[PDB]
Design a protein around this ligand. Structure first.
Ligand SMILES: Nc1nc2[nH]cnc2c(=O)[nH]1
Length: 262
């Protein structure tokens, strides 16, 4: 299990871009790809996880554990107390995976403390915890991500609202940005300011699996059936070919079976 480090406290659009590129190259399957777009690995492939160490201002760090298969965040850890490693596992993580998050995030058995996230990783759950009707009401941004790391890291106790806000920002700026070139671009274009995700970034996040299946199944660049998406203005956007959606997509969800590689 490799760790990718990104300093949020001091970066540039180029460093952010290199970060996402390293994560994509680390997450992706060496050989899997459809129409030039790299695809995530099978649940069987090792390693199964990838760590993302986020270095914020004021020496505040938080490490995110990501499942390579779908890039979902399983949980995160932070340096706690003196030399203790505090791991936080999502409520929706179960079975052997819970032990993997615990031992992968905090590899030192003698000095690890736990603080479970008492809710699941679904956006609607995160949005209700954060106290909003939609995550579009929560601004994303480098400085915002840095600020949230400071509210969590090393902090004895924090509200579920504060933890949810952190998750909402971290997931979209890390996982969602790695999956979609479009979302990466939105971040870079608004790099020096806070911004609200437009209808297209939220739609893209919510239909990633469908897009991945559609592209994998497309024949001669034509989607099996018309894909109804939403553009940046909030208007219906009908896609018929892979060429029309490919520019906004960096990574495909794992879809079993063969597909036209290029
Ligand atoms: N852990 C996790 N929860 C999510 N909720 C919506 N998208 C995601 C994601 O990529 N990861």
């Amino acid at each position: 299990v490799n760790t990718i480090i990104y300093n949020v406290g001091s970066t540039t659009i180029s460093k952010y871009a290199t970060f996402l590129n390293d994560l994509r190259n680390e997450a992706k399957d060496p050989s899997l790809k459809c129409y030039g777009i790299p695809m995530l690995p099978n649940t069987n492939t090792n390693p199964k996880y990838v760590l993302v160490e986020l270095q914020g201002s004021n020496k505040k760090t938080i490490t995110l554990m990501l499942r390579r298969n779908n890039l979902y965040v399983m949980g995160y850890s932070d340096p706690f107390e003196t030399n203790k490693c505090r791991y936080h596992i999502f409520n929706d993580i179960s079975g052997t995976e819970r032990q993997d998050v615990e031992t992968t995030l905090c590899p030192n058995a003698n000095s690890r403390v736990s603080k479970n996230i008492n809710f699941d990783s679904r956006y609607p759950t995160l949005e209700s915890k954060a106290g909003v009707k939609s995550r579009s009401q929560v601004q994303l941004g480098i400085q915002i991500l840095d600020s949230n790391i400071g509210k969590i890291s090393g902090v004895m106790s924090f509200t579920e609202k504060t933890e949810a806000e952190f998750l909402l920002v971290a997931i979209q700026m890390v996982s969602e940005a790695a999956r979609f070139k479009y979302i990466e671009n939105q971040v870079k274009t608004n790099f020096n300011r806070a911004f609200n995700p437009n209808p297209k970034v939220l739609n893209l996040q919510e239909t990633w699996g469908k897009i991945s299946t559609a592209i994998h199944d497309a024949k001669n660049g034509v989607l099996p059936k018309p894909l109804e998406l939403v553009d940046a203005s909030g208007a219906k956007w009908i896609v018929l070919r892979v060429d029309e959606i490919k520019p906004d997509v960096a990574l495909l969800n794992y879809v079993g079976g063969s597909c036209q590689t290029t």
